Each structure stands twice: as C-alpha cells, then as structure tokens.
Scaffold this motif. Structure first.
Motif, mmCIF file in Angstrom:
data_model
loop_
_atom_site.group_PDB
_atom_site.id
_atom_site.type_symbol
_atom_site.label_atom_id
_atom_site.label_comp_id
_atom_site.label_asym_id
_atom_site.label_seq_id
_atom_site.Cartn_x
_atom_site.Cartn_y
_atom_site.Cartn_z
ATOM 1 N N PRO A 13 0.792 -1.250 0.000
ATOM 2 C CA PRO A 13 0.000 0.000 0.000
ATOM 3 C C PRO A 13 0.815 1.285 0.000
ATOM 4 C CG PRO A 13 -0.705 -1.478 1.754
ATOM 5 C CD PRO A 13 0.590 -2.011 1.239
ATOM 6 N N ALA A 14 2.114 1.238 0.249
ATOM 7 C CA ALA A 14 2.901 2.463 0.239
ATOM 8 C C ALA A 14 2.813 3.136 -1.124
ATOM 9 C CB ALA A 14 4.362 2.163 0.573
ATOM 10 N N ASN A 15 2.885 4.468 -1.124
ATOM 11 C CA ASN A 15 2.732 5.227 -2.362
ATOM 12 C C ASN A 15 3.725 4.804 -3.428
ATOM 13 O OD1 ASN A 15 0.584 6.961 -1.521
ATOM 14 N ND2 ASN A 15 2.088 8.020 -0.236
ATOM 15 N N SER A 16 4.974 4.517 -3.036
ATOM 16 C CA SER A 16 5.967 4.153 -4.041
ATOM 17 C C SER A 16 5.506 2.953 -4.860
ATOM 18 C CB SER A 16 7.321 3.868 -3.392
ATOM 19 O OG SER A 16 7.273 2.790 -2.470
ATOM 20 N N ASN A 17 4.770 2.024 -4.249
ATOM 21 C CA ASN A 17 4.243 0.887 -4.985
ATOM 22 C C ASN A 17 2.872 1.203 -5.580
ATOM 23 O OD1 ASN A 17 6.416 -1.014 -4.432
ATOM 24 N ND2 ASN A 17 5.632 -1.170 -2.353
ATOM 25 N N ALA A 18 1.898 1.516 -4.728
ATOM 26 C CA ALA A 18 0.507 1.606 -5.170
ATOM 27 C C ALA A 18 0.251 2.795 -6.089
ATOM 28 C CB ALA A 18 -0.422 1.694 -3.954
ATOM 29 N N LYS A 19 1.009 3.882 -5.933
ATOM 30 C CA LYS A 19 0.725 5.123 -6.640
ATOM 31 C C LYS A 19 1.885 5.561 -7.513
ATOM 32 C CE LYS A 19 -3.244 6.410 -4.611
ATOM 33 N NZ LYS A 19 -4.537 6.172 -5.262
ATOM 34 N N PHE A 20 2.914 4.730 -7.664
ATOM 35 C CA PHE A 20 3.990 5.048 -8.587
ATOM 36 C C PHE A 20 4.338 3.822 -9.430
ATOM 37 C CE2 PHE A 20 8.455 5.454 -9.766
ATOM 38 C CZ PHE A 20 8.341 6.563 -10.590
ATOM 39 N N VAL A 21 4.914 2.771 -8.841
ATOM 40 C CA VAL A 21 5.352 1.640 -9.672
ATOM 41 C C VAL A 21 4.160 0.898 -10.277
ATOM 42 C CG1 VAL A 21 6.684 -0.500 -9.721
ATOM 43 C CG2 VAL A 21 7.535 1.426 -8.465
ATOM 44 N N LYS A 22 3.044 0.783 -9.544
ATOM 45 C CA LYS A 22 1.881 0.088 -10.098
ATOM 46 C C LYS A 22 1.345 0.807 -11.328
ATOM 47 C CE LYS A 22 -2.628 -1.862 -8.884
ATOM 48 N NZ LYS A 22 -3.531 -0.874 -9.533
ATOM 49 N N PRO A 23 1.001 2.091 -11.274
ATOM 50 C CA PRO A 23 0.538 2.752 -12.503
ATOM 51 C C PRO A 23 1.610 2.842 -13.582
ATOM 52 C CG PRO A 23 0.805 4.332 -10.719
ATOM 53 C CD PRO A 23 0.880 2.969 -10.100
ATOM 54 N N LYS A 27 1.063 1.411 -17.435
ATOM 55 C CA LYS A 27 1.368 2.134 -18.665
ATOM 56 C C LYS A 27 2.289 1.310 -19.546
ATOM 57 C CE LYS A 27 0.846 6.338 -15.988
ATOM 58 N NZ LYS A 27 1.565 7.459 -15.331
ATOM 59 N N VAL A 28 3.301 0.692 -18.941
ATOM 60 C CA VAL A 28 4.233 -0.110 -19.718
ATOM 61 C C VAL A 28 3.507 -1.291 -20.355
ATOM 62 C CG1 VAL A 28 6.211 -1.655 -19.413
ATOM 63 C CG2 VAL A 28 6.281 0.679 -18.551
ATOM 64 N N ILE A 36 5.037 -6.462 -22.205
ATOM 65 C CA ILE A 36 5.963 -6.255 -21.094
ATOM 66 C C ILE A 36 5.147 -6.317 -19.812
ATOM 67 C CG2 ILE A 36 7.702 -4.805 -20.036
ATOM 68 C CD1 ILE A 36 8.068 -3.468 -22.765
ATOM 69 N N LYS A 37 5.365 -7.370 -19.039
ATOM 70 C CA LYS A 37 4.599 -7.649 -17.827
ATOM 71 C C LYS A 37 5.514 -7.470 -16.626
ATOM 72 C CE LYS A 37 1.640 -11.074 -20.091
ATOM 73 N NZ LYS A 37 1.003 -12.397 -19.844
ATOM 74 N N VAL A 38 5.318 -6.389 -15.880
ATOM 75 C CA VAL A 38 6.076 -6.133 -14.663
ATOM 76 C C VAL A 38 5.353 -6.777 -13.493
ATOM 77 C CG1 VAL A 38 6.979 -4.360 -13.152
ATOM 78 C CG2 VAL A 38 6.929 -3.978 -15.612
ATOM 79 N N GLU A 39 6.045 -7.654 -12.772
ATOM 80 C CA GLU A 39 5.520 -8.239 -11.547
ATOM 81 C C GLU A 39 6.089 -7.476 -10.358
ATOM 82 O OE1 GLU A 39 6.697 -12.345 -11.682
ATOM 83 O OE2 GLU A 39 5.352 -12.831 -13.349
ATOM 84 N N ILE A 40 5.214 -7.026 -9.452
ATOM 85 C CA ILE A 40 5.606 -6.168 -8.337
ATOM 86 C C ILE A 40 5.731 -6.983 -7.052
ATOM 87 C CG2 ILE A 40 4.895 -4.237 -6.884
ATOM 88 C CD1 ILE A 40 3.597 -2.988 -9.424
ATOM 89 N N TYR A 41 6.946 -7.034 -6.516
ATOM 90 C CA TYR A 41 7.216 -7.748 -5.271
ATOM 91 C C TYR A 41 7.617 -6.744 -4.201
ATOM 92 C CZ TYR A 41 6.822 -11.754 -8.227
ATOM 93 O OH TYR A 41 6.303 -12.695 -9.083
ATOM 94 N N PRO A 42 6.688 -6.317 -3.355
ATOM 95 C CA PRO A 42 6.991 -5.358 -2.304
ATOM 96 C C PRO A 42 7.550 -6.097 -1.097
ATOM 97 C CG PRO A 42 4.700 -5.911 -2.170
ATOM 98 C CD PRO A 42 5.281 -6.739 -3.294
#
Ligand SMILES: O=C(O)Cc1cccc(O)c1
Length: 318
Positions: A13-23, A27-28, A36-42
């Motif tokens: 839920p931190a902004n760096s993930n939810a409101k920066f890297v996720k959006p 876009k990518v 191009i599929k980015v998987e996010i591992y916080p």
C-alpha cells in the motif's frame, strides 16, 4: 512477451508501490500491447534486506528496483550533495535537478545501471513521540533516526543523538524505545503507522526544506539492452527527465493526505522560522563544508557539485 521482476522494500500500500510503480507498470503493459509484464514484489518478498536492492538490480537477480540511494553508504557519492541541509525545494523541482545531475556530472554513479529515474521526496519533517522541536536545543538528548549517513550527520550537527536505519525498521525502534523520533517526509508515515507513534511534528518555513534523500528507480542494464527496440521505446517513454518530474509532482502531492492523517491522529505541527530556523541553517553551512571535504577525499570536486546541485534546483524551482 517479457516478464520483468520488480523488487522493493515498502509494503504494497505504500505510495511508491501503489501510486507510482503500479501505474507505471500499467502504462508499460498497455503501451507494449500487453507484452511487457512487470511483476511487483513489495516488502522484500524476493529475499534480502533493503540495502541489497541495488546489488540485486545491478547483477540481475531482479530486473527493476525502487530504493533509497543512501541505504548503501558511499555507493552513490555524487548524489550525497542533494542530501545536504536546506538543499531541497519541492520534490518536483529537486527531482528534475537530480535527473539532470545524473544525466550530466553524476553519470558515473549509475553507469552500471539503466536509469529509469532518480528523484526525491518532498523535504522531510522532524517527528518525535512527545517533545516539540522548536529549536536545535530541543533535540538535546533525543535519539533521532535518519535514513542515510549524510542525514544522520545533519542530525548530529543539529544536536541530536543520531541513529540510522531503513524506514521499515523505524516503527519497531520507536516501540522498543531505542529512538525518540525520526526524520521522514509525511507520505511514508501511514504505511508504517508512524503518525500514530509520533505526535509532535516540525517543518521549516521558507524556500528550502530541511533535507531530502534521493530515490533510485533502476533497471538491470543487460535486461534493458536485451529488449527489442519497440520494447525499449516503451520503457524510455516511461523514463528520463519527464518521469523524474512526474515522480516529483506525485511525491509533493503524497504529503497532503498523510499530513492530514497525522493531524487526525492528534499531532501538532510547528513551523520553524526566524532565529530558530537561522540557527539550523548556520549549522547547515558547516555541514556543507564537512561534506565538501569528504567528497574531495573521495576524488570528487565537492564544491563544484554543491554549486551544481543548488543551480539545478534553482533552474527548476519555477
Ligand atoms: O528512509 C527514508 O526516510 C527515505 C524514504 C523511504 C521511503 C519513502 C520515503 O518518502 C522516504
């Protein structure tokens, strides 16, 4: 199709993930026609501790990271200039300055990486459990956390008892009584309930805030170079100065709801001005001199870099 593993330390839920890297990743995905599929591992979910993120992305353990440069002391020495007291304006202006700096005089710090963007948070604030910080004297006897060696050196110079640790460790350290407070921007505090563990908050008036610390949004260089040219175009549409500016804007905005949560949690907010502020800025001048000396010893033109940082920040603070 290409899967990219993103790794970082804050929780999802931190902004760096939810409101920066996720959006960013959305876009990518869309602009690459789903390829191009980015998987996010916080939350360091792929292993290791936060200082290791830069090693992981450099060596290709993961493909993309977001991290704090100073969590690895001395590794990105040019970027330290941007951590000096009363250097930063808004995150939007200071982030653009950081990226142009990295594109030019500081490029050697990041030559082993594909830079997506270097940027920073809105100037950090001073947080304590109960003691209002109205002057440097109020820091006497206070065990205060900072994120990096340059910022703990600032805390030392302002009269605090300095402690370093990455931000996920701060709540536990407060809970155990091993620190009395910390510096962070507002925006990161709710992700770790830090606004429920500190009730007194101090900020600074005027055109420059207390400090910031540079963030690194990096891709493994070999992985980037292995992409097709159409995929590189997608990444690069989502990189560079335009991304650094966007990130800075976003980080300025992130402060607002977090500050409100701190007030709803019963916090006080005190804004330094006048004599108390001037006293801290005077200590800051000595800390600039200390840093220039350390930079010179490490083969950098410390004086040139400080002036460069100031001039770039002025350029974008419009
Ligand atoms: O550790 C820190 O104080 C730097 C940091 C880390 C994560 C989010 C932020 O806004 C700031």
């Amino acid at each position: 199709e290409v899967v990219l593993k993103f790794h970082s330390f804050p929780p999802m839920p931190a902004n760096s993930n939810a409101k920066f890297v996720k959006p960013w990743s959305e876009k990518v995905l869309a602009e690459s026609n789903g390829e191009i599929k980015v998987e996010i591992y916080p939350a360091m979910q792929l292993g290791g501790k936060p200082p290791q993120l830069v090693d992981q992305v450099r060596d290709g353990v993961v493909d993309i990271v977001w991290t704090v440069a100073g969590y690895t002391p001395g590794r990105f020495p040019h970027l330290e200039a941007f951590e000096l007291p009363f250097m930063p304006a808004s995150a939007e202006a200071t982030s653009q300055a950081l990226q142009e700096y990295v594109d030019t005089v500081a490029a050697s710090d990041l030559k082993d990486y594909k830079v997506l963007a270097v940027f920073c948070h809105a100037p950090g604030k001073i947080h304590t459990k109960e003691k209002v910080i109205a002057s440097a004297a109020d820091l006497n006897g206070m065990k205060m956390r900072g994120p990096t060696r340059v910022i703990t050196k600032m805390l030392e110079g302002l009269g605090a008892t300095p402690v370093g640790m990455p931000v996920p460790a701060v709540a536990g350290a407060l809970s155990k009584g091993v620190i009395d407070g910390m510096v962070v921007p507002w925006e990161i505090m709710p992700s770790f309930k830090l606004h429920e563990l500190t009730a007194a908050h101090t900020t600074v008036s005027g055109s420059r805030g207390l400090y910031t610390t540079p963030f690194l949004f990096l891709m493994n260089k070999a992985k980037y170079e292995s992409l097709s040219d159409e995929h590189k175009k997608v990444i690069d549409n989502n990189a560079g100065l335009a991304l650094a500016k966007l990130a800075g804007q976003l980080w300025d905005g992130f402060e607002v709801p977090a500050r409100k949560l701190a007030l709803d949690a019963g916090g006080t907010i005190h804004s330094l001005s006048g004599g108390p502020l001037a006293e801290m800025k005077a200590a800051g001048e000595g800390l600039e001199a200390d840093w220039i000396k350390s930079a010179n010893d490490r083969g950098l033109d410390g004086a040139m870099l400080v002036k460069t940082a100031k001039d770039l920040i002025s350029k974008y603070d419009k």
